[PDB]
Amino acid sequence: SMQGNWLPGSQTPAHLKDLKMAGNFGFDPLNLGAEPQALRWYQQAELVHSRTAMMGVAGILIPGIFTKLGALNVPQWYEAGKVYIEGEGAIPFGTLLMTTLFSYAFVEGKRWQDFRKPGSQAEPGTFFGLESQFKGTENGYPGGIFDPLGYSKTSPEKLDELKLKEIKNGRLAMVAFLGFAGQYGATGKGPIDNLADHLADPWHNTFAENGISVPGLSAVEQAAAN
Amino acid sequence: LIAAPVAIGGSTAALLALGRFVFLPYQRRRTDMEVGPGRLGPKTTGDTFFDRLQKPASFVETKSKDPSGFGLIDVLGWGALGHVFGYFLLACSSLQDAGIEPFPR
Amino acid sequence: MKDFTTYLSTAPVVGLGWAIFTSGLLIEINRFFPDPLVFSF
Amino acid sequence: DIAGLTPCSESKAYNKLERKELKVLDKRLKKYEPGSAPYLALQATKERTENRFKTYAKQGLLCGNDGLPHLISDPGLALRFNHAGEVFIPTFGFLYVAGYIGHVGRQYIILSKEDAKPTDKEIILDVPLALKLAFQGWAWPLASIQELRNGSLLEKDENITVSPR
Amino acid sequence: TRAGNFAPGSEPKDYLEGLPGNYNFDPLELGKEKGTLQRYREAELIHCRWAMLGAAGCLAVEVLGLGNWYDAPLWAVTGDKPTWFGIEVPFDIATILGVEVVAMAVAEGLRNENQDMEKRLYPGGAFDPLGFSKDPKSFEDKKLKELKNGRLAMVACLGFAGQHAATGKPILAALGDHLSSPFFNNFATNGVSVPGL
Amino acid sequence: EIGPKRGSLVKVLRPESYWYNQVGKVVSVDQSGIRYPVVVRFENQNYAGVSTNNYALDEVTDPP
Amino acid sequence: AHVVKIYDTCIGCTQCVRACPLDVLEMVPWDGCKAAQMASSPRTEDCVGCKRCETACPTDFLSVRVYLGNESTRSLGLAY
Numbered sequence: 001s002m003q004g005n006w007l008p009g010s011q012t013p014a015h016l017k018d019l020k021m022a023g024n025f026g027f028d029p030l031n032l033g034a035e036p037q038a039l040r041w042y043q044q045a046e047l048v049h050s051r052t053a054m055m056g057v058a059g060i061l062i063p064g065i066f067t068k069l070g071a072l073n074v075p076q077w078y079e080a081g082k083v084y085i086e087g088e089g090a091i092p093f094g095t096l097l098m099t100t101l102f103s104y105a106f107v108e109g110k111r112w113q114d115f116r117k118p119g120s121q122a123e124p125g126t127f128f129g130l131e132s133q134f135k136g137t138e139n140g141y142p143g144g145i146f147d148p149l150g151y152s153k154t155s156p157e158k159l160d161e162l163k164l165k166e167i168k169n170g171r172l173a174m175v176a177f178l179g180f181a182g183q184y185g186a187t188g189k190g191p192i193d194n195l196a197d198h199l200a201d202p203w204h205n206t207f208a209e210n211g212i213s214v215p216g217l218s219a220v221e222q223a224a225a226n
Numbered sequence: 227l228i229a230a231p232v233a234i235g236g237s238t239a240a241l242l243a244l245g246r247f248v249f250l251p252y253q254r255r256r257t258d259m260e261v262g263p264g265r266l267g268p269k270t271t272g273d274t275f276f277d278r279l280q281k282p283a284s285f286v287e288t289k290s291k292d293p294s295g296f297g298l299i300d301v302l303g304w305g306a307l308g309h310v311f312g313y314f315l316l317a318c319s320s321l322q323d324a325g326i327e328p329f330p331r
Numbered sequence: 332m333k334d335f336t337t338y339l340s341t342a343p344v345v346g347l348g349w350a351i352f353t354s355g356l357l358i359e360i361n362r363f364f365p366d367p368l369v370f371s372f
Numbered sequence: 373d374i375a376g377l378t379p380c381s382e383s384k385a386y387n388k389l390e391r392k393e394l395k396v397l398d399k400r401l402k403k404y405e406p407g408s409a410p411y412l413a414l415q416a417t418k419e420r421t422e423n424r425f426k427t428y429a430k431q432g433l434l435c436g437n438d439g440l441p442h443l444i445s446d447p448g449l450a451l452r453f454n455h456a457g458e459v460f461i462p463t464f465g466f467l468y469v470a471g472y473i474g475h476v477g478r479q480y481i482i483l484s485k486e487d488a489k490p491t492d493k494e495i496i497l498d499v500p501l502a503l504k505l506a507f508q509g510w511a512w513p514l515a516s517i518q519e520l521r522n523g524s525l526l527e528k529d530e531n532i533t534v535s536p537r
Numbered sequence: 538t539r540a541g542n543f544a545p546g547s548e549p550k551d552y553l554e555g556l557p558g559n560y561n562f563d564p565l566e567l568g569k570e571k572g573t574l575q576r577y578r579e580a581e582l583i584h585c586r587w588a589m590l591g592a593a594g595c596l597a598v599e600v601l602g603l604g605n606w607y608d609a610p611l612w613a614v615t616g617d618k619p620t621w622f623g624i625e626v627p628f629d630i631a632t633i634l635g636v637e638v639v640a641m642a643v644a645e646g647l648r649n650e651n652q653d654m655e656k657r658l659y660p661g662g663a664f665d666p667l668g669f670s671k672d673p674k675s676f677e678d679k680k681l682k683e684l685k686n687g688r689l690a691m692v693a694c695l696g697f698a699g700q701h702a703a704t705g706k707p708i709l710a711a712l713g714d715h716l717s718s719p720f721f722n723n724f725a726t727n728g729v730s731v732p733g734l
Numbered sequence: 735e736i737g738p739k740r741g742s743l744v745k746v747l748r749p750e751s752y753w754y755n756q757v758g759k760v761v762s763v764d765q766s767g768i769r770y771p772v773v774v775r776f777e778n779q780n781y782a783g784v785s786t787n788n789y790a791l792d793e794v795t796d797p798p
Numbered sequence: 799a800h801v802v803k804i805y806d807t808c809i810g811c812t813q814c815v816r817a818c819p820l821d822v823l824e825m826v827p828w829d830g831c832k833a834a835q836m837a838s839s840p841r842t843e844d845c846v847g848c849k850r851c852e853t854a855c856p857t858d859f860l861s862v863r864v865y866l867g868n869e870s871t872r873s874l875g876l877a878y
């Protein structure tokens with residue numbers, strides 16, 4: 001049901017009050033999730049944007065953290081594309097992009113056909129006999145081989161808690177990646193260097209101090225200094 | 227350059243043989259769904275001199291001296307097709323014999 | 332206030348408020364930023 | 373270097389045009405004292421001219437046989453070569469705002485039509501609903517796609533006035 | 538009786554049920570009308586048979602080491618004597634074109650005048666001298682296998698055409714290039730199949 | 735009695751009418767047996783300026 | 799002169815005869831309307847085609863129709 005609120009005192013949309021959702025806070029002022037399986041499609045869009053954002057951010061911080069500690073010489077994420085391509089063991093960019101596009105289209109084709117008809121991928125004799133566990137128990141939550149440790153076959157009150165923990169860490173990594181592109185756009189440095197700069201020197205290292213994010217604010221500082 | 231009489235005669239004999247032994251059963255079926263009984267048929271009725279000119283001729287519907295329906299008009303048309311094909315082949319051979327290559331290299 | 336703000340809500344004032352807002356927005360963009368041709372960030 | 377157009381950074385006619393504009397702008401500079409306000413305005417105009425010529429160059433812009441920069445319109449050619457900022461990204465930039473105005477006009481038309489004497493609402497605007505719809509139109513293509521599939525966007529012609537031919 | 542699905546969970550089209558090679562493949566709803574469906578069926582069957590013939594020629598020119606399929610018809614351009622299986626036939630190119638056009642004309646004229654749908658699809662008789670179509674079960678099995686290998690050959694012919702349009706190497710050379718360094722030698726490395734890699 | 739209910743929304747299928755494939759409200763239906771007894775009122779005026787018109791029985795059906 | 803035709807859609811507000819300053823239209827009894835009236839044009843040779851009856855017609859489409867053509871000395875409105 002309803003847990004928390006994105007804005008206390010705001011008028012909750014009617015489609016979000018009695019709705020059983022993972023991480024629902026009433027945050028839909030534009031009423032995009034008014035229709036029911038339209039919200040199901042955007043639930044899957046939010047889940048699949050967050051899951052690749054989780055892997056993307058973890059692929060940025062954990063190599064970035066280990067770079068600060070000096071264990072690995074892994075470069076920064078923004079220049080990692082040119083680092084691998086210019087290397088002597090480089091698969092060409094056209095081959096990599098075609099392989100990524102072909103592999104994801106096959107995967108997202110199964111994900112798409114699961115959405116239109118739930119449990120339709122469990123038809124016998126299609127994926128060499130192992131498609132019997134490929135039936136999605138919930139929209140955006142397929143299960144089966146995707147949960148081989150049995151961490152979802154638990155009490156129902158623990159399941160939505162795990163779903164709430166998934167969407168909360170999913171949204172947090174999702175705004176983190178926007179911060180990562182914005183901080184590379186403004187400062188031109190990695191998130192680890194930016195975090196160390198803010199920790200060691202918080203006042204002089206701010207997005208307001210940088211003129212890229214807020215144009216003309218540095219001229220206000222220069223005019224006030226003179 | 228290919229000799230003209232043998233090429234022309236072979237092309238027109240092949241086209242006449244195709245018209246009589248091959249294309250004739252497919253003929254008189256496209257026309258049967260074109261000028262057949264229940265469909266269009268006659269465009270005119272026939273009252274005046276300027277209106278009888280669109281009536282069919284007198285020598286194209288008499289009977290069939292050939293075992294098939296291959297009449298004089300069909301003979302003329304398929305012979306014209308054969309002459310056309312033979313002249314096309316002769317023209318291509320002449321263009322090749324002049325040292326000019328029309329085909330892409 | 333209600334009687335006057337009903338007149339304030341009619342189309343000629345809306346024909347100004349949108350006009351003033353959009354015009355001033357474009358003036359400030361063309362003023363603080365120079366005249367560009369390419370959206371190359 | 374497509375369609376026989378040299379880049380603006382390496383074009384002689386582009387620099388000759390810049391020198392000609394600097395010459396005529398400095399011609400008016402000799403008629404005023406340097407400590408005057410028309411001199412400051414002319415200096416700011418010259419600075420804006422120099423900044424515009426510098427920023428128009430080194431940005432992938434190209435020109436041919438005139439000294440005036442050209443725009444590449446074909447997609448793909450403007451994507452393989454760095455020319456997407458000319459018209460490719462302004463295309464989606466305009467369409468977002470163009471679809472913004474069309475969507476908020478549609479929602480206001482729909483909302484006003486389910487009200488008594490709706491003809492008055494077109495000449496008597498209401499501010500709180502129009503401003504709420506104005507700030508609830510950022511996701512216009514997302515609202516447009518969902519209405520397209522389900523028939524709320526369109527209307528069957530059995531309730532549409534059609535010509536009697 | 539369906540031989541599989543082109544997509545697990547697709548919408549089952551009711552107009553492709555009692556047909557060989559039924560995968561419910563088409564999403565464009567082509568061949569909804571029965572006569573157009575039969576016309577497209579016989580067109581697909583004879584297109585796939587010609588795909589068999591073309592793939593067989595293009596592969597037998599490679600596995601026999603007699604040249605490549607693309608420069609095989611270059612004998613008429615240079616005006617030398619044509620060779621087939623090391624026989625050295627002496628026939629002139631114009632005679633080849635004439636006999637080919639008249640033979641294919643009589644073949645497609647006698648084929649089109651069957652005037653019955655089942656034998657327009659599957660004639661039998663003189664065209665089936667081995668007589669393995671006596672029982673319906675093996676007949677439909679060979680129908681399914683013929684249609685599957687025919688669709689595969691129809692893909693293969695366009696594959697050969699695209700491979701030669703990209704690189705001048707023959708089919709076996711491209712197969713060896715993909716066998717040796719698949720990541721360094723494929724369609725994405727030439728830069729012409731996809732614009733800008 | 736012979737026509738639609740009074741006050742019910744109806745659809746006009748008269749081709750030459752301005753309100754072809756439109757929705758109008760029945761204001762009166764005549765029971766005297768005249769040519770066009772079904773009289774309806776429309777919310778939007780025509781080009782002349784009127785807002786009401788009369789139609790026959792076959793020109794009036796319930797809209798979906 | 800001009801041809802003036804009145805269709806059965808007329809229901810008799812007796813106002814199309816007032817808008818015509820030429821005495822072209824007249825009103826006859828009828829039975830196809832509530833008012834039991836129907837417009838008629840006895841002096842159709844005296845009409846000029848000014849279409850004032852069309853402006854006065856409230857039916858959609860109009861019950862009275864005036865068609866131009868075959869003009870004469872009276873339908874052209876010349877006093878000379």
Ligand code: CLA
Pocket residue numbers: 473474475476477478480502505506
């Ligand atoms: C927001 C309302 C709205 C919408 C969604 C449309 C949509 C359409 N119109 Mg229409 N139009 C409108 C208002 C609108 N029009 C107004 C107010 C006028 C009078 C000036 C016209 C005059 C008009 C003509 C003459 C034509 C169209 C055509 C079209 C079509 C082409 C799309 C387009 O950009 O046309 C171009 C539209 C214009 C040039 C009009 C621009 C006027 C402004 C932008 C509208 C302002 C509306 C306002 C801001 C909404 C209030 C917001 C609310 C929050 C209060 C499309 C179906 C064309 C067609 O038939 O295509 C099939 C066509 O020939 N329209």
Ligand SMILES: CC(/C=C/C=C(C)/C=C/[C@@]12O[C@]1(C)C[C@@H](O)CC2(C)C)=C\C=C\C=C(C)\C=C\C=C(C)\C=C\[C@@]12O[C@]1(C)C[C@@H](O)CC2(C)C
Pocket residue numbers: 563564565566567584585587588590591592593594595605606607608609610691692694695
């Ligand atoms: C006949 C054929 C090939 C014939 C080859 C021949 C004669 C080759 C002969 C030679 O090579 C030799 C032996 C040796 C060489 O030295 C000389 C030549 C002379 C060159 C290929 C057909 C090839 C046929 C092909 C490739 C057909 C492709 C069809 C497609 C893609 C259909 C599309 C759709 O499926 C979608 C996408 C979606 C659906 O909704 C809708 C539909 C319409 C069903």
Ligand SMILES: CC1=C(/C=C/C(C)=C/C=C/C(C)=C\C=C\C=C(C)/C=C/C=C(C)/C=C/C2=C(C)CCCC2(C)C)C(C)(C)CCC1
Pocket residue numbers: 238239301302303304305306309310311313
């Ligand atoms: C009698 C008889 C017979 C025989 C027959 C024959 C043998 C025939 C042939 C025929 C032929 C063998 C041919 C024909 C022809 C016809 C025609 C009618 C033609 C035409 C032509 C044309 C028209 C041409 C044209 C041209 C020119 C002029 C120039 C340029 C080129 C061209 C080509 C275009 C038999 C015994 C069988 C039987 C009995 C009877």
